[PDB]
mmCIF file of C-alpha atoms in Angstrom:
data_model
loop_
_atom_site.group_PDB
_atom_site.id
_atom_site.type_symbol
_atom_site.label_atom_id
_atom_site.label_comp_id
_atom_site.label_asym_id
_atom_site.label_seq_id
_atom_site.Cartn_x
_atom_site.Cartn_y
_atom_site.Cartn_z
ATOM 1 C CA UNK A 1 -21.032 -10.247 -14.771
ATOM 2 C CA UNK A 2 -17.787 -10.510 -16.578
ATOM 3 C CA UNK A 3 -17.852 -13.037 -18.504
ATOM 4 C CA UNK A 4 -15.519 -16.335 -17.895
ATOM 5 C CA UNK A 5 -13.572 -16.018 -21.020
ATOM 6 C CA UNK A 6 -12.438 -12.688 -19.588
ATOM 7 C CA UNK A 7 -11.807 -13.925 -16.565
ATOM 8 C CA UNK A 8 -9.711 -16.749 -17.603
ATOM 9 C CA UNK A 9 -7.856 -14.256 -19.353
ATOM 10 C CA UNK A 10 -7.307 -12.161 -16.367
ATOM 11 C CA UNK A 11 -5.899 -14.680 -14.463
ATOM 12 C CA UNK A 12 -3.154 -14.922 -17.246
ATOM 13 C CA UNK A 13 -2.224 -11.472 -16.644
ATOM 14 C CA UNK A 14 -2.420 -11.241 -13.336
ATOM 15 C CA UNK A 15 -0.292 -14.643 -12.248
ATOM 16 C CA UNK A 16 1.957 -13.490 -14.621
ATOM 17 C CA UNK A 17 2.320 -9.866 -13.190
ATOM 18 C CA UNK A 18 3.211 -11.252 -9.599
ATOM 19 C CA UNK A 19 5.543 -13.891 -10.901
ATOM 20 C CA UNK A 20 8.014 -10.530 -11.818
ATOM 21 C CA UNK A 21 6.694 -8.693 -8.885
ATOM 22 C CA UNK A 22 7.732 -11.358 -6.670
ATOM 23 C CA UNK A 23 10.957 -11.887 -8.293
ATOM 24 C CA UNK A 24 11.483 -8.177 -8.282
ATOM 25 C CA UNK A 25 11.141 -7.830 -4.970
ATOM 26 C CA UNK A 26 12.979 -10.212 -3.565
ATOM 27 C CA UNK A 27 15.956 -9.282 -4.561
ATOM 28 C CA UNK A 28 15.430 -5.972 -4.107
ATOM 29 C CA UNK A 29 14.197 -5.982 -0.346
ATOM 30 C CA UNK A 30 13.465 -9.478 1.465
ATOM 31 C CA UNK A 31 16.920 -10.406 0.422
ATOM 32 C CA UNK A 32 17.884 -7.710 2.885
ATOM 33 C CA UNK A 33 15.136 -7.510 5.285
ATOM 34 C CA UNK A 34 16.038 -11.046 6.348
ATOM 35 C CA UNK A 35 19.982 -10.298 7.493
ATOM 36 C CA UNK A 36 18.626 -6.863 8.916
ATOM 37 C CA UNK A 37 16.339 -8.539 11.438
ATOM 38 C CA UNK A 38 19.025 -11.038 12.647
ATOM 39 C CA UNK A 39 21.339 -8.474 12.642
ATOM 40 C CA UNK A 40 19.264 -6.723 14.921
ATOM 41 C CA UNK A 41 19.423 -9.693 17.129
ATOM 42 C CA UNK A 42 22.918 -9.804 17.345
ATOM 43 C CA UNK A 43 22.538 -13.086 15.761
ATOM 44 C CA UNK A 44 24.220 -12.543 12.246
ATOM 45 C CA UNK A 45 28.012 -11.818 13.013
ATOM 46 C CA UNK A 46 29.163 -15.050 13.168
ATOM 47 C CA UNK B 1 8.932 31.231 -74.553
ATOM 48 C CA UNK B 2 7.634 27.804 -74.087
ATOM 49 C CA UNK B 3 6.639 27.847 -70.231
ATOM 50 C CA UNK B 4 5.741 24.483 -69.577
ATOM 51 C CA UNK B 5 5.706 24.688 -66.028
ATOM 52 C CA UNK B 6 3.865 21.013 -65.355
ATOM 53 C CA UNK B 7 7.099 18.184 -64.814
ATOM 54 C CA UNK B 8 9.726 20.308 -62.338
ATOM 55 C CA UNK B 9 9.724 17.565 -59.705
ATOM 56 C CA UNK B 10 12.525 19.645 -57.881
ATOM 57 C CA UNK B 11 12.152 17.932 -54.191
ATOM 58 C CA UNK B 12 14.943 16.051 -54.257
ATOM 59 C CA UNK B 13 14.425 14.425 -51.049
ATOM 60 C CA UNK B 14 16.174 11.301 -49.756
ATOM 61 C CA UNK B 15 16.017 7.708 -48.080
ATOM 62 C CA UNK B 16 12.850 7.550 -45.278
ATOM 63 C CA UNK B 17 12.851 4.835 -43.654
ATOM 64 C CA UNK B 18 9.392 3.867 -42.451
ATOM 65 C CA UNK B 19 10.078 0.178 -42.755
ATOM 66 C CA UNK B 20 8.518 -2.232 -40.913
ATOM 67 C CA UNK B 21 9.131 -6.065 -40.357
ATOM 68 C CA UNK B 22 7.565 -9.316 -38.602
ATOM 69 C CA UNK B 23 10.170 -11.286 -37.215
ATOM 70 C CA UNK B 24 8.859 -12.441 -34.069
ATOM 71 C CA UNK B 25 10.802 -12.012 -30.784
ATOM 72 C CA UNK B 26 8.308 -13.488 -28.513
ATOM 73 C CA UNK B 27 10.106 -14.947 -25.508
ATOM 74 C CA UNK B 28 7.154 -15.901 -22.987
ATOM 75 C CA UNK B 29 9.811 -17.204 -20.365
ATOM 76 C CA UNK B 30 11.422 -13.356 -20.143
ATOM 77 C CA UNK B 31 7.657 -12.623 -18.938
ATOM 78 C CA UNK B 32 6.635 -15.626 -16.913
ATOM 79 C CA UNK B 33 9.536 -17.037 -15.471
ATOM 80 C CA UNK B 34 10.553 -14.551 -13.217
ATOM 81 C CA UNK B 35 13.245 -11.972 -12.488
ATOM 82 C CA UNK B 36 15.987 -12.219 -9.881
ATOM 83 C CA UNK B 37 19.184 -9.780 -9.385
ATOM 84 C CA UNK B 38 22.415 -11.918 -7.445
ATOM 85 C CA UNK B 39 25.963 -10.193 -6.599
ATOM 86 C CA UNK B 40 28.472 -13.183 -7.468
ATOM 87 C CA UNK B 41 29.271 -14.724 -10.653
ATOM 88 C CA UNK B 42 27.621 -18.303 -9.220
ATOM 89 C CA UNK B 43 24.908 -19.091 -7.374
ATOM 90 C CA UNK B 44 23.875 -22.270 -5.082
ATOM 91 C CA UNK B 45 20.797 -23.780 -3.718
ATOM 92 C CA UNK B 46 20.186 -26.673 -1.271
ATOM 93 C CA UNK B 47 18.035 -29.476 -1.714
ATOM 94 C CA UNK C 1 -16.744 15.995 14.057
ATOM 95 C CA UNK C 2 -13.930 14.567 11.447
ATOM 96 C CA UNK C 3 -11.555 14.834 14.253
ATOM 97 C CA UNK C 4 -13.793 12.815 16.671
ATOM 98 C CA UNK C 5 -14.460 10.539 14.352
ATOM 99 C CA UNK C 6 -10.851 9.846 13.229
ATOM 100 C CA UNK C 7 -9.344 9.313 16.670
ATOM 101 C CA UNK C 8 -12.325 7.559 17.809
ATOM 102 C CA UNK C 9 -11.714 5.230 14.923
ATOM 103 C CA UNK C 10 -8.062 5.151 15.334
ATOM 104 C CA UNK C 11 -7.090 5.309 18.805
ATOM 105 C CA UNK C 12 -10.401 4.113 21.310
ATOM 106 C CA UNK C 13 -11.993 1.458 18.559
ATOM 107 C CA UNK C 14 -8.976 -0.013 16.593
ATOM 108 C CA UNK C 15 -5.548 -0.700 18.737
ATOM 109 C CA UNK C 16 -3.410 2.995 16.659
ATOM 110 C CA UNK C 17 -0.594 2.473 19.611
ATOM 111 C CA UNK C 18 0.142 -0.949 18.496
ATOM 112 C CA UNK C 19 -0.500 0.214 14.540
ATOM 113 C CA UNK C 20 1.932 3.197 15.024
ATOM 114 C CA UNK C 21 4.703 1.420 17.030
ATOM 115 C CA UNK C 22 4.683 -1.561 14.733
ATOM 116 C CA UNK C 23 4.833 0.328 11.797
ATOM 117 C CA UNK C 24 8.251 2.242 13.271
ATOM 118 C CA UNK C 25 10.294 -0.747 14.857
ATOM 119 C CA UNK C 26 9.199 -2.846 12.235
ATOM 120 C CA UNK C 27 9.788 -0.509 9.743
ATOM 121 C CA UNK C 28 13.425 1.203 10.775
ATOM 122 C CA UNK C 29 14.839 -2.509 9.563
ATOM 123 C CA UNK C 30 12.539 -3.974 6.969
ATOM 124 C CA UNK C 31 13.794 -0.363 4.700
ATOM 125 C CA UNK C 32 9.627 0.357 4.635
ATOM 126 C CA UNK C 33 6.857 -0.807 6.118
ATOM 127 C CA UNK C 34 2.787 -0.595 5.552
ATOM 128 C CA UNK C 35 -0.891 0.447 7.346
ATOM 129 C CA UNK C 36 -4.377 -0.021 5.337
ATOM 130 C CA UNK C 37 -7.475 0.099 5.763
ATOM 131 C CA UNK C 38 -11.107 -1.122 5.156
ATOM 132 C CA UNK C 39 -14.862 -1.361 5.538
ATOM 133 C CA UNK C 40 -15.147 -4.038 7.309
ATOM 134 C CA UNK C 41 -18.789 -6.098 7.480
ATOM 135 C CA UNK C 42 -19.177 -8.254 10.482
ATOM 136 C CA UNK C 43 -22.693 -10.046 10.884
ATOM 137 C CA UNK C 44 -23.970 -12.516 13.686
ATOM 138 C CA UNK D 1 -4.247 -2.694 10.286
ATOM 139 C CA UNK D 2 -0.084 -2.874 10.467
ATOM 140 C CA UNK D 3 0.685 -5.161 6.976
ATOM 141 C CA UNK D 4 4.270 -6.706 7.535
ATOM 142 C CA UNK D 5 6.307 -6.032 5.113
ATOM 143 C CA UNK D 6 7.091 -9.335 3.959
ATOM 144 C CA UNK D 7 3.528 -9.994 2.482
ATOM 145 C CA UNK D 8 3.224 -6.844 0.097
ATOM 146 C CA UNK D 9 4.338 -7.326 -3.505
ATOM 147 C CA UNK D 10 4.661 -4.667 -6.325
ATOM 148 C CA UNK D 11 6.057 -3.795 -9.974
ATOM 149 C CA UNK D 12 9.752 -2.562 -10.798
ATOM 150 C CA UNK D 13 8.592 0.219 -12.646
ATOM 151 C CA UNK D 14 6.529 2.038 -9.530
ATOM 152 C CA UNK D 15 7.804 4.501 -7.646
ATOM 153 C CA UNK D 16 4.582 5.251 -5.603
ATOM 154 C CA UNK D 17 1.362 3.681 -4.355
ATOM 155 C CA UNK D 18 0.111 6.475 -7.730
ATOM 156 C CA UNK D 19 1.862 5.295 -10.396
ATOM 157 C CA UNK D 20 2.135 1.961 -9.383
ATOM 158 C CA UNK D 21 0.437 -0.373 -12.554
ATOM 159 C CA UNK D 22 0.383 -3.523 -10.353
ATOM 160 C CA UNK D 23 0.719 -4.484 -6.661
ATOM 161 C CA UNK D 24 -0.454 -7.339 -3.978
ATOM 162 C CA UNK D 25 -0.741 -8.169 -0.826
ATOM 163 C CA UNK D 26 -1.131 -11.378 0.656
ATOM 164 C CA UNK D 27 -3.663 -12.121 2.947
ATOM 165 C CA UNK D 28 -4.089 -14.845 5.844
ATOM 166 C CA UNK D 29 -8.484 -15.067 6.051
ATOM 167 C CA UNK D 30 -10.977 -17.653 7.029
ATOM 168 C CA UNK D 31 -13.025 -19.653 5.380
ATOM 169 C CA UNK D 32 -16.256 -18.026 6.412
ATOM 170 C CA UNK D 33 -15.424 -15.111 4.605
ATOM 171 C CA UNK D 34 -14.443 -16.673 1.257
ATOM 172 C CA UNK D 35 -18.413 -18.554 1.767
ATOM 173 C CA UNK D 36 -19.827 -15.237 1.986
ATOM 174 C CA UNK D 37 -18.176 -14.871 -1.565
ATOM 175 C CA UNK D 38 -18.173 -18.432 -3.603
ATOM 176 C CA UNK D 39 -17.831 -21.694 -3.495
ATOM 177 C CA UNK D 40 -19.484 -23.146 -0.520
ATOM 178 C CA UNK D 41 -20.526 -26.907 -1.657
ATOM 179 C CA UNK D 42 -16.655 -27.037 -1.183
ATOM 180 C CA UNK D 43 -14.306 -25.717 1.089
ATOM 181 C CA UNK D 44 -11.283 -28.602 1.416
ATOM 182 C CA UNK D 45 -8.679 -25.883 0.477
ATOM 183 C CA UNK D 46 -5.383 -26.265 1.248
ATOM 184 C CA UNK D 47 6.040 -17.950 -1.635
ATOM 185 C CA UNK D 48 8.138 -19.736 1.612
ATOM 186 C CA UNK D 49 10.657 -16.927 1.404
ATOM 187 C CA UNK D 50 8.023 -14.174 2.659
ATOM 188 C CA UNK D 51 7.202 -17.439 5.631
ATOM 189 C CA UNK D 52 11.019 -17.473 6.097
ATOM 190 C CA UNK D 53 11.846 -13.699 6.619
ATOM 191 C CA UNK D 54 9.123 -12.740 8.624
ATOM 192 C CA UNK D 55 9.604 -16.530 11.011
ATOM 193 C CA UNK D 56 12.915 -14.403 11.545
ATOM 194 C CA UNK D 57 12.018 -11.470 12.797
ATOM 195 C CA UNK D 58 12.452 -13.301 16.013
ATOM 196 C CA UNK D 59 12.595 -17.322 15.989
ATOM 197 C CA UNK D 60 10.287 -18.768 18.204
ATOM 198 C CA UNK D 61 7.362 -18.376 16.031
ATOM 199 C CA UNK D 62 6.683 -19.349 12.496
ATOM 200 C CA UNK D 63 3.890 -18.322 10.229
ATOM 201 C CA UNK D 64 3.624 -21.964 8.161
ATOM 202 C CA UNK D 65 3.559 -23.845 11.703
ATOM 203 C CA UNK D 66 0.336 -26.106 12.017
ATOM 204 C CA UNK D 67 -1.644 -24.235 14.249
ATOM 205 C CA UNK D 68 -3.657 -27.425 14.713
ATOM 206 C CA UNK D 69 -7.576 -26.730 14.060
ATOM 207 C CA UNK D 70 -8.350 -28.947 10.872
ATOM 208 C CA UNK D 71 -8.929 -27.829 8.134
ATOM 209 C CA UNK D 72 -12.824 -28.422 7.966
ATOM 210 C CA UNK D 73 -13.294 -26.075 10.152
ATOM 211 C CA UNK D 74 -15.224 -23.464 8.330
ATOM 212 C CA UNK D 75 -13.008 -20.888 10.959
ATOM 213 C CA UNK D 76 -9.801 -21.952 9.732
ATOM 214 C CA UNK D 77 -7.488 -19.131 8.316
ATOM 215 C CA UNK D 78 -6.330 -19.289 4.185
ATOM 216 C CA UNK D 79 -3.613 -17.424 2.301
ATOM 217 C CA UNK D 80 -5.346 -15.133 -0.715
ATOM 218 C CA UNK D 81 -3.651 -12.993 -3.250
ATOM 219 C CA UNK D 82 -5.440 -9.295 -2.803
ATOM 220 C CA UNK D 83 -4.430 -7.441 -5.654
ATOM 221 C CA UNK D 84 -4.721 -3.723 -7.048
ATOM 222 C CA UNK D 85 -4.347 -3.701 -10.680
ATOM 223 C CA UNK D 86 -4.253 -1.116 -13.745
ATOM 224 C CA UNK D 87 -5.751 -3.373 -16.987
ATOM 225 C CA UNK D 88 -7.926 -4.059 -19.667
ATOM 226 C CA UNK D 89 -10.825 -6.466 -17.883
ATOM 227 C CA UNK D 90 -12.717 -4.383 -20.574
ATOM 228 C CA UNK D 91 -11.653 -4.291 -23.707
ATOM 229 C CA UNK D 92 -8.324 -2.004 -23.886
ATOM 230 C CA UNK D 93 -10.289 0.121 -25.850
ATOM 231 C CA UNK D 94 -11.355 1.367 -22.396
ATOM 232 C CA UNK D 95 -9.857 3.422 -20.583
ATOM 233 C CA UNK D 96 -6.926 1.310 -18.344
ATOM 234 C CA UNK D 97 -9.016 1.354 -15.192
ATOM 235 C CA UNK D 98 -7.538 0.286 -12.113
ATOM 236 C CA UNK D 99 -9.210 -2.677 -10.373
ATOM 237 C CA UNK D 100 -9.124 -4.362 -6.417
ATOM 238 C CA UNK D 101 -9.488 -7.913 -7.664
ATOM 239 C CA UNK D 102 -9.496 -11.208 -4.701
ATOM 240 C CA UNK D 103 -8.649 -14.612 -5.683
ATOM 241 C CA UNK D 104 -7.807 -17.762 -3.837
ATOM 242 C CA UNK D 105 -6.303 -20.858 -6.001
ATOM 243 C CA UNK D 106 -7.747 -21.185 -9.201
ATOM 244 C CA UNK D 107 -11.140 -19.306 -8.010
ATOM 245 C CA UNK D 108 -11.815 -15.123 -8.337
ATOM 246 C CA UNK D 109 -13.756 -13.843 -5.849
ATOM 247 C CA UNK D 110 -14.670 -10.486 -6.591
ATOM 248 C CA UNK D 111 -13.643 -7.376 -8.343
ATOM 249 C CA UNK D 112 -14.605 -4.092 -7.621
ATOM 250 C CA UNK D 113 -13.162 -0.479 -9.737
ATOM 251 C CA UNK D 114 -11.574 1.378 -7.522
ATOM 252 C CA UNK D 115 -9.867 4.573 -7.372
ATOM 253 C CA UNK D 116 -7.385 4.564 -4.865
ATOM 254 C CA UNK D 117 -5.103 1.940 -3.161
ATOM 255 C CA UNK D 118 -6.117 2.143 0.556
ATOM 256 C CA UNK D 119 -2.457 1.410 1.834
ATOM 257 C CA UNK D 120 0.498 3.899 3.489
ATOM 258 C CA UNK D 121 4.239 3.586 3.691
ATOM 259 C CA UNK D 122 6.262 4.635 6.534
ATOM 260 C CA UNK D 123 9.873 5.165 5.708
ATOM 261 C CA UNK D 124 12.576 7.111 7.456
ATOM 262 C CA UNK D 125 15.195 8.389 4.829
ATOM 263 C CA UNK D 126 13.752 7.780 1.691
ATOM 264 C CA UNK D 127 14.888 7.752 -1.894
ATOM 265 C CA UNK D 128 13.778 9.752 -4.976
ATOM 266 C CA UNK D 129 13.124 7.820 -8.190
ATOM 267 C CA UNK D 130 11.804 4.850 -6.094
ATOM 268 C CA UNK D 131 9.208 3.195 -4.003
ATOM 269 C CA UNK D 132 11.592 2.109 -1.288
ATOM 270 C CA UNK D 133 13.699 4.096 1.066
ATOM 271 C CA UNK D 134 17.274 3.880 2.798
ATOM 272 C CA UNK D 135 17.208 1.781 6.719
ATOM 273 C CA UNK D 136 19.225 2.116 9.571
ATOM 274 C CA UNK D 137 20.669 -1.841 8.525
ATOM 275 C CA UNK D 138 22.049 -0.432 5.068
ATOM 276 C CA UNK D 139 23.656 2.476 7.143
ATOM 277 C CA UNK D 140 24.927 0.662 10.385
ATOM 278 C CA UNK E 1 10.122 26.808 21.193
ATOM 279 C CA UNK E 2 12.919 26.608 23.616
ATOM 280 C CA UNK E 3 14.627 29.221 22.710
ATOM 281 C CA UNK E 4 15.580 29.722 26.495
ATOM 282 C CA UNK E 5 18.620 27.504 25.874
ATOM 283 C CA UNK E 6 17.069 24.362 24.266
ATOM 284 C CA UNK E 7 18.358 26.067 20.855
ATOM 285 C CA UNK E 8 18.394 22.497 19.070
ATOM 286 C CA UNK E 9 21.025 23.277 16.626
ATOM 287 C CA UNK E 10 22.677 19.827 17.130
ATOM 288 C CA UNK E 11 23.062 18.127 13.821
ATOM 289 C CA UNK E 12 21.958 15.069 15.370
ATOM 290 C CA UNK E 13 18.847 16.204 16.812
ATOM 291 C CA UNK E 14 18.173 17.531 13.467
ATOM 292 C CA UNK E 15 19.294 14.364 11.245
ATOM 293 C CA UNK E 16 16.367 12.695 13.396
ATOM 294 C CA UNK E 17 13.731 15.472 12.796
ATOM 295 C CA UNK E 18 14.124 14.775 9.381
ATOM 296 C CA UNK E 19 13.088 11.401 9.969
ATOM 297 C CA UNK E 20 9.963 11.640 11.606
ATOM 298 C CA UNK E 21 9.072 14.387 9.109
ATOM 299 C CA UNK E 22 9.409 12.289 6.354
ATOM 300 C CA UNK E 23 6.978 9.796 8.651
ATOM 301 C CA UNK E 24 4.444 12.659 8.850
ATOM 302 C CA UNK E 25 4.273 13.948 5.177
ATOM 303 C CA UNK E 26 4.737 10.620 3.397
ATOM 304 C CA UNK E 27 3.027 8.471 5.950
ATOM 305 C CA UNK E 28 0.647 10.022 8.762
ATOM 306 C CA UNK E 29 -1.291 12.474 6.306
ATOM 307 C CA UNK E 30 -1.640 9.751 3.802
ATOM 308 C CA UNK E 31 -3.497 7.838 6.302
ATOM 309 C CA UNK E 32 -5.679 10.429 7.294
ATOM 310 C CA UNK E 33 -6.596 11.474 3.868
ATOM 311 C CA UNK E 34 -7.014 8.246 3.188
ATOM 312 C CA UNK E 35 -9.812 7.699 5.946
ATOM 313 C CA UNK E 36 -11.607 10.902 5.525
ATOM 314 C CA UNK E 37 -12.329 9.779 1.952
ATOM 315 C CA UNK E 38 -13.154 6.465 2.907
ATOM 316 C CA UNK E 39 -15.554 7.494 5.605
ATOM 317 C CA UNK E 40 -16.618 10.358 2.910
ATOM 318 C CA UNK E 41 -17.729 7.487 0.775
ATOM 319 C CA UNK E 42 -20.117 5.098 2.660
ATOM 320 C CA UNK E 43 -22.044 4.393 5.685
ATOM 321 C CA UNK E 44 -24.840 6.891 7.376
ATOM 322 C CA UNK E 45 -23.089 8.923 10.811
ATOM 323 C CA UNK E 46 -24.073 10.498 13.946
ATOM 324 C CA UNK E 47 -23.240 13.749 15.667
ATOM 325 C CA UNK E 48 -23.750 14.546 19.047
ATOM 326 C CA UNK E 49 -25.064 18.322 18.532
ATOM 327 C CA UNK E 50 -25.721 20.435 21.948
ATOM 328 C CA UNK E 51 -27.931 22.973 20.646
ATOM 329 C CA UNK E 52 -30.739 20.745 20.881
ATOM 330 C CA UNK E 53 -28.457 17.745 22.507
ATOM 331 C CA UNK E 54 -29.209 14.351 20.368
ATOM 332 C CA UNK E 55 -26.655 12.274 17.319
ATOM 333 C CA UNK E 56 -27.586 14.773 13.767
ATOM 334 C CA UNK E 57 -27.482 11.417 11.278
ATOM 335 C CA UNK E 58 -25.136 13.829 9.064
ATOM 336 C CA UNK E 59 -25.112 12.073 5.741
ATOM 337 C CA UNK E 60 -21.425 12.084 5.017
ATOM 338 C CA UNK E 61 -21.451 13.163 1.757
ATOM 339 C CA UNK E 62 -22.557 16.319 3.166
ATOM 340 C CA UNK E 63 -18.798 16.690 4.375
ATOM 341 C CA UNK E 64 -15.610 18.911 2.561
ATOM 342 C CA UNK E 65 -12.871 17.982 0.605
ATOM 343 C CA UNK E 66 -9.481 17.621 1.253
ATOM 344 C CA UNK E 67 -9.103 20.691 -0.497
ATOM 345 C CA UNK E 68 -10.418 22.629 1.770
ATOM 346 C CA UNK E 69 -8.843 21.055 4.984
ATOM 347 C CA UNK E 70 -5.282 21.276 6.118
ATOM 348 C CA UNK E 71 -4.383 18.283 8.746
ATOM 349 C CA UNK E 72 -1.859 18.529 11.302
ATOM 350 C CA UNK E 73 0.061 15.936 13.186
ATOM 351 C CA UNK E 74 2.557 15.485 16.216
ATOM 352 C CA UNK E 75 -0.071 17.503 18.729
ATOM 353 C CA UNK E 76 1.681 18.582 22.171
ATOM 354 C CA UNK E 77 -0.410 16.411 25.303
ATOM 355 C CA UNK E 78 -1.219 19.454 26.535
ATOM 356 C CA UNK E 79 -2.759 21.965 23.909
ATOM 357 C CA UNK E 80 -5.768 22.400 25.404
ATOM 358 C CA UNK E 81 -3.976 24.226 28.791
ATOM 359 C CA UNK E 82 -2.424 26.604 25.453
ATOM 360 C CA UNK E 83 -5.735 26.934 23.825
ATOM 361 C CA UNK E 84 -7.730 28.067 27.171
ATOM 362 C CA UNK E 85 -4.779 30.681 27.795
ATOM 363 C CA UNK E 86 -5.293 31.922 23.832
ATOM 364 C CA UNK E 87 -9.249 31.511 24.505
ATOM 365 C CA UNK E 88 -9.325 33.947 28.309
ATOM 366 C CA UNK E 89 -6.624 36.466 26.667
ATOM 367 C CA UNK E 90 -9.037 36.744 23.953
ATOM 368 C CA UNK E 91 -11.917 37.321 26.397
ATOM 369 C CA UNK E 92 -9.937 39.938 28.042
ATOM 370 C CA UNK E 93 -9.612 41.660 24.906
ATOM 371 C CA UNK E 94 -13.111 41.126 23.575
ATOM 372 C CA UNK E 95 -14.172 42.405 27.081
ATOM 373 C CA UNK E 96 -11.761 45.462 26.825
ATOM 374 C CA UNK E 97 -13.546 46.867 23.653
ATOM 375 C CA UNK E 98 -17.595 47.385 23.949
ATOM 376 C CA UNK E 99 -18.378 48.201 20.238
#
């Protein structure tokens, strides 16, 4: 269907979207998901 | 006497400023490096 | 017949008390957590 | 299904699964799926920090170990990007439509239009203006 | 509904309730709208009607819209014992009048 010159020009845009999306939301949430978990477990506290 | 009435040109209007310009401001690496947001003022990684 | 089918679905096919407990204790910490859905399309 | 939250990606500017313009998950499937799709004269295919926080929500397990059927094997499991996307595969011209798109490394295997994103949140205490919420870590 | 001395006005009790309603309007009846457009959407389904007893294929399409349809969560085990009491006191009444 879509032709393969669209498509390698979707891949552009889409890599490129989750390269800020993933650098987004790390620092945003995973960051803190990770110390709330061993937290959790008593682990963290040192 | 003598109406003329054809070169009044009474707008008077000033400056617009509807410029526009081409100096490029591209920056690909603000789009496809990445974005991170740290607390301190430096940062370390092991290796 | 929605409600059948729903909690038929939900609770009696797919494994909802695992879904629904998961998606609290492993939510309450992780700030939000996530459920989806499909069609699946098995075939032998 | 329950979708961890460690393997769900999405844009700065969302608030909502609605006005969200792009968003992923990451997906752990098998082979034999992906050959119902493209591909299949090959099949040798072969992010840590989403491995590394959900390996510690406890610590004996973790989700990079080698689970130890080889690779071969046509029922062996493979990391894909799922992704729900609002963009111009047309022509922007077009209306933005928003799209479910699949890919594995350097492959695409299918695209559909869709109008919906068929994923849910749970959150105690949320947060206006935002996607994400408040959790009893950031009060405790 | 305890009103008998239950009165749950205890500010913690309450700063909980507000969690799990948040869970309910932001979460639960997401996922069932979510479904009931989903199933409203594909596939061919079965009833199992009395009247004659035997599965009506019901093309789903056939169905409502959200619109129409309020969803409720958070059921008590036991509404059904409720709904027979609400059902007989009916019948009472519906027996009391013969017009």
């Amino acid at each position: 269907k879509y032709s393969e010159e669209v498509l390698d020009e979707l891949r552009v845009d889409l890599q490129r979207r989750f390269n800020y999306a993933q650098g987004y939301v790390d620092m945003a949430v995973k960051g803190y998901a990770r110390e709330a978990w061993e937290y959790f477990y008593g682990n963290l506290p040192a | 006497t003598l109406f003329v009435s054809y070169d009044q040109n009474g707008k008077k209007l000033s400056f617009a400023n509807w410029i526009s310009v081409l100096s490029p401001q591209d920056t690909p690496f603000v789009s496809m490096t990445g974005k991170e947001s740290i607390n301190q003022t430096i940062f370390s990684w092991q290796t | 017949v929605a409600t059948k089918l729903v909690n038929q679905i939900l609770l009696r096919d797919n494994p909802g008390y695992n879904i629904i407990s998961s998606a609290a204790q492993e939510c309450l910490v992780t700030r939000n957590s996530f459920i989806k859905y499909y069609w699946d399309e098995q075939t032998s | 299904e329950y979708v961890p939250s460690e393997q769900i990606f999405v844009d700065e500017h969302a608030t909502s699964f609605a006005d969200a313009q792009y968003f992923c998950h990451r997906v752990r499937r098998s082979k034999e799926d992906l050959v119902a799709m493209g591909f299949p004269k090959d099949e040798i295919e072969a992010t840590t920090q989403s491995t590394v926080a959900w390996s510690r929500t406890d610590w004996r397990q973790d989700i990079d170990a080698d689970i130890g059927t080889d690779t071969e094997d046509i029922a062996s499991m493979v990391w894909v990007y799922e992704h729900y996307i609002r963009t111009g595969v047309l022509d922007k011209n077009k209306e933005s439509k928003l799209y479910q798109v699949i890919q594995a490394g350097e492959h695409i295997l299918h695209t559909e239009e869709v109008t919906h994103i068929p994923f849910v949140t749970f959150c105690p205490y949320p947060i206006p203006g935002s996607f994400y919420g408040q959790s009893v870590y950031d009060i405790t | 509904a305890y009103a008998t001395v239950g009165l749950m006005m205890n500010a913690a009790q309450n700063r909980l309730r507000m969690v799990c309603r948040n869970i309910a309007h932001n979460g639960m009846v997401e996922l069932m709208r979510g479904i009931y457009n989903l199933i409203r959407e594909n596939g061919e389904v079965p009833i199992e009607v009395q009247t004659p007893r035997g599965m009506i294929q019901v093309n789903p399409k056939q169905l409502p819209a959200r619109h129409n349809l309020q969803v409720v969560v958070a059921i008590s085990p036991n509404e059904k014992a409720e709904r027979a009491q609400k059902l007989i006191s009916l019948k009472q009444l519906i027996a009391a009048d013969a017009q």
